[PDB]
Design an enzyme around this catalytic site. Structure first.
Site, PDB file in Angstrom:
ATOM      1  CD  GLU A 156      -3.202  -0.845   1.972  1.00 42.61           C
ATOM      2  OE1 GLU A 156      -3.084  -0.273   3.076  1.00 42.61           O
ATOM      3  OE2 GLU A 156      -4.308  -1.181   1.492  1.00 42.61           O
ATOM      4  CE  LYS A 204     -10.304  -7.929   8.582  1.00 42.69           C
ATOM      5  NZ  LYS A 204      -9.722  -7.621   7.249  1.00 42.69           N
ATOM      6  CD  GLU A 259      -2.718   1.193  -5.247  1.00 51.95           C
ATOM      7  OE1 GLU A 259      -2.965   0.287  -4.419  1.00 51.95           O
ATOM      8  OE2 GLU A 259      -3.605   1.809  -5.878  1.00 51.95           O
ATOM      9  CD  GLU A 276     -11.031  -9.524   4.346  1.00 47.87           C
ATOM     10  OE1 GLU A 276     -11.256  -8.978   5.446  1.00 47.87           O
ATOM     11  OE2 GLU A 276      -9.948  -9.407   3.734  1.00 47.87           O
ATOM     12  CB  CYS A 317      -7.240  -4.144   7.327  1.00 49.74           C
ATOM     13  SG  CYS A 317      -7.476  -3.524   9.005  1.00 49.74           S
ATOM     14  CB  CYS A 321      -9.484  -3.723  14.758  1.00 50.51           C
ATOM     15  SG  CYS A 321      -9.493  -3.510  12.965  1.00 50.51           S
ATOM     16  CD  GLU A 330     -11.892 -12.248  -6.962  1.00 45.71           C
ATOM     17  OE1 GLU A 330     -10.674 -12.266  -6.677  1.00 45.71           O
ATOM     18  OE2 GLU A 330     -12.312 -12.091  -8.130  1.00 45.71           O
ATOM     19  CB  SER A 389      -4.890   0.351  -1.715  1.00 42.65           C
ATOM     20  OG  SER A 389      -3.940  -0.655  -2.012  1.00 42.65           O
TER      21      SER A 389
HETATM   22  S1  SF4 Z   1     -13.214  -4.595  13.608  1.00 46.65           S
HETATM   23 FE1  SF4 Z   1     -14.604  -3.039  13.160  1.00 46.65          FE
HETATM   24  S2  SF4 Z   1     -13.076  -2.022  12.076  1.00 46.65           S
HETATM   25 FE2  SF4 Z   1     -11.699  -3.607  12.473  1.00 46.65          FE
HETATM   26  S3  SF4 Z   1     -12.340  -4.636  10.711  1.00 46.65           S
HETATM   27 FE3  SF4 Z   1     -13.839  -5.638  11.850  1.00 46.65          FE
HETATM   28  S4  SF4 Z   1     -15.224  -4.074  11.401  1.00 46.65           S
HETATM   29 FE4  SF4 Z   1     -13.707  -3.046  10.309  1.00 46.65          FE
HETATM   30 CL   LIG Z   2      -6.844  -7.812   8.424  1.00 49.50          CL
END
Ligand code: SF4
Ligand SMILES: [Cl-]
Ligand code: SF4
Ligand code: SF4
Ligand code: SF4
Ligand code: SF4
Ligand code: SF4
Ligand SMILES: [Cl-]
Ligand SMILES: [Cl-]
Ligand SMILES: [Cl-]
Ligand SMILES: [Cl-]
Ligand SMILES: [Cl-]
Ligand SMILES: [Cl-]
Ligand SMILES: [Cl-]
Ligand SMILES: [Cl-]
Ligand SMILES: [Cl-]
Ligand SMILES: [Cl-]
Ligand SMILES: [Cl-]
Ligand SMILES: [Zn+2]
Ligand SMILES: [Zn+2]
Lengths: 618, 621
Positions: A320, A405, A323, A408, A346, A550, A413, A366
């Site tokens: 990053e 997460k 970039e 994700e 992230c 986070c 992908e 990014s």
């Molecule tokens: S914790 Fe809150 S901020 Fe950190 S990633 Fe999961 S959601 Fe996005």
């Molecule tokens: Cl992460």
């Protein structure tokens, strides 16, 4: 080996019950004539009985038919194995049979039962079929296939009750549900679970108020539902429910089963922000770094390798920062094709947030993957290959503070050939419960080191866990290499602070950068509206969905005392970890540099794009 | 064998065998001082006028040439020991992914039969390369595939001690195409059938014919402006393609893939063919419309290299086994007072009704039968039963369907009819495409000797064959269902009420105590008329058939263009199918011994659990 919901890891006339019975254990079973579970304390919650496996490698499979009628003691087949896995209605049959098949395959593969070698391949195909069902890539034909495979195996093993045949017979409806409706009614199949409002909704409307993008419609006390098309998976609704009506799965049992599977390599990564909050459940203050306690506890659970997501964050910064430097050089060169600001974050929540509301800014973010997915891909395509393991022979578990997460890691992908780079996610809360029920106390366990090759990390990587840290790390590296100067003070206090929407101006040499930071997606909306209107200009932005970043994730333990003070405490714990590191720029990490020197050759190379970059907004 | 040309032709010192994308494939005598471009020109250039893309030297082993070698003296040293001196020329119309899949599979076959033992050590690696390529062609990849390929390439180049591995140069030279395939899910030459969608291309002149032809009003556009397809509502009926004065609407063409599979050593290729093909293909070779030339097709397919020739009409008999059962069940439940049941039951192998019902008749999603089409029933059986019996995994059999329409291409592309990236129907070839393959390959159906269709999945009854013309599906299902509901064998098995040519036909069939009201529509506008009448209650039906093409499948867009009066020729083809039916000893699907064997050995009876698992699907999931 152990198993129970709410967790446990249990490490003549004797049995070993470790199913869905409260209080797993061995017990001395009396010889008197349904209430056997009661002697083991009933089943977790009050879920009705589903089945009971006899002998873990192989024995009999008991169903409801034995429940209120004489449970013939001796029918525990001569190969009782002295263990029982009892099933309740809370256990998915597909997942259980996957675990059963994998245990049998491991014991075949290690020579324990060579008499089954003849059927090895056949059973493997069964697992594959089961796996396809759990991944949602099947038609009803799978049942046909399974039946025949069952028939085949029972021929060579000469058995009067083949488990798979009975599984088809007795749980046909569940299997058909999985296949045709893509639904796992117990929600154990994480790849069939979506964030959903269940029947326990009372229509209180808290979620509707809490949603920053207004994802929920529904009025009065009428059941509310999530419009998945706009959902950012920020997880505000889950935390806001007066009840447990919103469910997003819980991979705890999968984690335990994998840990109990012989000769299965399980590795973990852990998010930067976990280590300054988890210890709260064991008497530590917010902000205290207990990463070594986590490492020792995970190893006690059976994890074979403990790594760190902060290493992946250092790699992410390499990409990053490269970039960002490229975009700045093009901007200063008069290339109007370039787009500013560049977003570095992230947090997955911005993806859906931007696509549905800022479609004029798809070129802003990014292209780099998140630290979690960068770690995962590197672990399976490089580290595992180095150790001579295919990607399916490594189970990579991410311990993260967020439900986003999970979403994700579930994205297709970030997978190849139905193998997901992150096999699944465990939240901080779920891990706390696993430790609590397994007798692991982080306060009293001896420290252990994290494994090196993908565990070493810089302070730039660690500050990822609180608002402003990602852009601070990227800026550190980018400004330092654009100016050629090493900064005396590497901390950028302007990027710190707690305001929802923060503006910073960093000067280094001839370079002047305007930075925007938002935590909380409403503040993010304010900042992006300002960018679009031209009320303000930015070179780079950071967007975090949770207040504080986070460290304030919904998967973290509920704060104790003043919420704001606790969140700031955790963030400053990350900042103090950073200040305690010899290396405070991501580009100093020797292991990440080794990644570039041996495989990808430099940031933004073709190989680096192929592995560490992705296409948001395809 | 070897061979290739886009008009398609499997063509079975100083002499070379040129078989690429050059016009006039063949064996050519190279002049002494000659470049590659000069050789290509001596073969008449490349199909259309597409520029040179690359040239493979030696089928298993040689070099890979790009534009840089075009104007450079063709040194013969590239023809190293026992290379057989062949060149496959590629134009910009050839997809590099498909070609490299073919190259890798060829090398793997030549390894697997022992003639190239020294490469055995890289077998697994080469196989993984193929897998990567396959994943790219199916659209299930990330950019990581390139990374993997690179290392695999390097690995091979290390283990063979070779100075130039082909795959490394492939990545270097066509990175943009590979990245396009992966990130954009786009094959710019459209040879990857699993990345092609029905699209109006840039050669569109805005004449608006397609918009007029569309029965669902799916195409937008005005004047000279390019027209566009709303793919969300498209039924794939193929009217637009037929109406286009130009080639502006493309739906892919798997001809080259078929040829490459045929040219791959020790690759098992089997075919099924739709009922309506056999009464139309012969028109291209001097037969009259309606003349059955199925045995000529069998012989021609075998000459091309097909290892087994089967028949979709067998699958139609199996379809009737399932559908007559479902129709009988629904009738019995209706007569018992079941308000749970829904009538009519729709029986039709045409994919076009699916979206047509989903997009406009969402109150009638419980109407269609759950039975698969004959094509997909054949496919599942071939790979999960026939191939298994012969000790072949599903990926070791290439099942090719010869069909009259693009809608069957779309059906064969559906993910429900696949497992583990293996599609039950690997791909579809239309009647026109097969005609062109025969013509360019020297196969003349008028003069070729007859050959038999293979038995186990080729035998079929007249009930199955009439599937190919309007009214046949419901006629066959009715034959079986009425005969078994009454216990009576009909003296006259033909139901003339279900025949005829009106767009919307109503029939009343009486048998014993049973009375059935049947509606038949061909042409989706007529289908809309009939379904509107059903919805308003203006008419009631026990069962309906819907066909998208006028006359049914004999009038499909993939069939050869008719000669003379279009309607007369279509009716001739339909009557040819009816005469095939009349010529059969067995004229009810439930008499077919091989279908009955399927039930006796595997599924045990129609509508069983096993039969549902294999031969049924969920339309409108
Ligand atoms: S914790 Fe809150 S901020 Fe950190 S990633 Fe999961 S959601 Fe996005
Ligand atoms: Cl992460
Ligand atoms: S908050 Fe929980 S309960 Fe209140 S409405 Fe939203 S979901 Fe139903
Ligand atoms: S998760 Fe965040 S976005 Fe998705 S619904 Fe709950 S609140 Fe709205
Ligand atoms: S018919 Fe062919 S050309 Fe005329 S509009 Fe439709 S597509 Fe464009
Ligand atoms: S195919 Fe049939 S439906 Fe789809 S566009 Fe062309 S005409 Fe309209
Ligand atoms: S009718 Fe026969 S040919 Fe015309 S589309 Fe439906 S299936 Fe294809
Ligand atoms: Cl372990
Ligand atoms: Cl260390
Ligand atoms: Cl919290
Ligand atoms: Cl390298
Ligand atoms: Cl190679
Ligand atoms: Cl062949
Ligand atoms: Cl069909
Ligand atoms: Cl068979
Ligand atoms: Cl198509
Ligand atoms: Cl025959
Ligand atoms: Cl035609
Ligand atoms: Zn499940
Ligand atoms: Zn392609």
């Amino acid at each position: 080996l152990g198993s129970v919901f709410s967790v446990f890891s249990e490490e003549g006339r004797k049995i070993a019950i470790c199913g869905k019975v409260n209080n797993p254990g061995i017990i001395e079973v009396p010889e008197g004539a349904n209430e056997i579970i009661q002697l083991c304390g009933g089943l977790i919650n009050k879920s009705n009985f589903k089945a009971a496996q006899i002998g873990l490698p192989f024995g009999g499979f008991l169903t409801e038919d034995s429940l209120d009628k004489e449970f013939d003691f001796g029918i525990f087949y001569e190969n009782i194995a002295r263990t029982i896995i009892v099933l309740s209605q809370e256990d998915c049959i597909i997942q259980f049979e996957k675990f059963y098949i994998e245990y049998l395959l491991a014991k075949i593969k290690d020579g324990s039962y060579k008499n089954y070698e003849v059927v090895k391949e056949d059973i493997t195909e069964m697992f594959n079929i089961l796996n396809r069902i759990s991944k949602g890539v099947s038609n009803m034909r799978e049942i046909y296939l399974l039946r025949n495979l069952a028939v085949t195996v029972k021929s060579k093993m000469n058995q009067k009750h083949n488990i798979m045949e009975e599984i088809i017979d007795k749980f046909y409806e569940e299997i058909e549900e999985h296949i045709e409706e893509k639904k796992c009614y117990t929600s154990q199949c994480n790849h069939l679970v979506k964030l959903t409002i269940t029947k326990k909704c009372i229509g209180c409307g808290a979620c509707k108020r809490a949603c920053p993008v207004d994802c929920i419609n529904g009025e009065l006390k009428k059941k509310h539902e999530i419009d998945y098309n706009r959902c950012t998976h920020c997880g505000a609704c889950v935390s806001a429910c007066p009840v447990d009506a919103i469910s997003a799965g819980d991979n705890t049992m999968l984690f335990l089963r994998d840990l109990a599977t012989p000769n299965k390599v399980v590795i973990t990564q852990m998010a930067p922000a976990v280590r300054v909050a988890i210890g709260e459940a064991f008497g530590f203050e917010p902000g205290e770094n207990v990463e070594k306690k986590i490492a020792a506890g995970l190893r006690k659970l059976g994890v074979d390798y403990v790594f760190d997501t902060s290493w992946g964050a250092d790699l992410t910064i390499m990409e990053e920062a490269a970039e960002l430097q490229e975009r700045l050089e093009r901007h200063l060169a008069g290339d109007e094709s370039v787009k500013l600001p560049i977003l570095t974050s992230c947090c997955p929540s911005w993806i859906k947030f931007i696509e549905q509301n800022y479609g004029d800014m798809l070129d802003v973010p990014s292209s780099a993957k998140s630290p979690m997915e960068m770690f995962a891909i590197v672990a399976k395509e490089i580290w595992a290959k180095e150790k001579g393991l295919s990607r399916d022979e490594v189970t990579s578990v991410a311990i993260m503070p967020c439900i986003a997460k999970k979403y994700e890691a579930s994205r297709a992908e970030f997978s190849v050939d139905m193998n997901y780079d992150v096999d699944y996610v465990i939240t901080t809360r779920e891990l706390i419960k696993i430790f609590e029920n397994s007798g692991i106390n982080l306060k009293e366990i001896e420290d252990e080191e994290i494994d090196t090759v993908m565990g070493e990390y810089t302070g730039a990587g660690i500050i990822f866990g609180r608002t402003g840290g990602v852009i601070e790390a990227a800026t550190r590296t980018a400004l330092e290499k654009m100016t050629g100067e090493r900064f005396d003070n590497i901390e950028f206090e302007g990027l710190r602070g707690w305001d929802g929407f923060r503006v910073c101006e960093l000067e280094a040499g001839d370079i002047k950068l305007r930075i925007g930071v938002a935590h909380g997606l409403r503040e993010a909306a304010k900042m992006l509206d300002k960018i679009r209107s031209g009320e303000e200009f930015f070179h780079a932005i950071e967007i975090m969905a949770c207040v504080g970043g986070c460290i304030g994730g919904g998967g973290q333990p509920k704060t104790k005392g003043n919420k704001q003070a606790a969140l700031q405490k955790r963030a400053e714990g990350l900042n103090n970890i950073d200040r305690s590191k010899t290396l405070r720029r991501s580009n100093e990490n020797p292991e990440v540099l080794a990644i570039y020197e041996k495989y990808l050759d430099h940031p933004l190379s073709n190989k680096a794009h192929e592995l560490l970059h992705t296409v948001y907004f395809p």
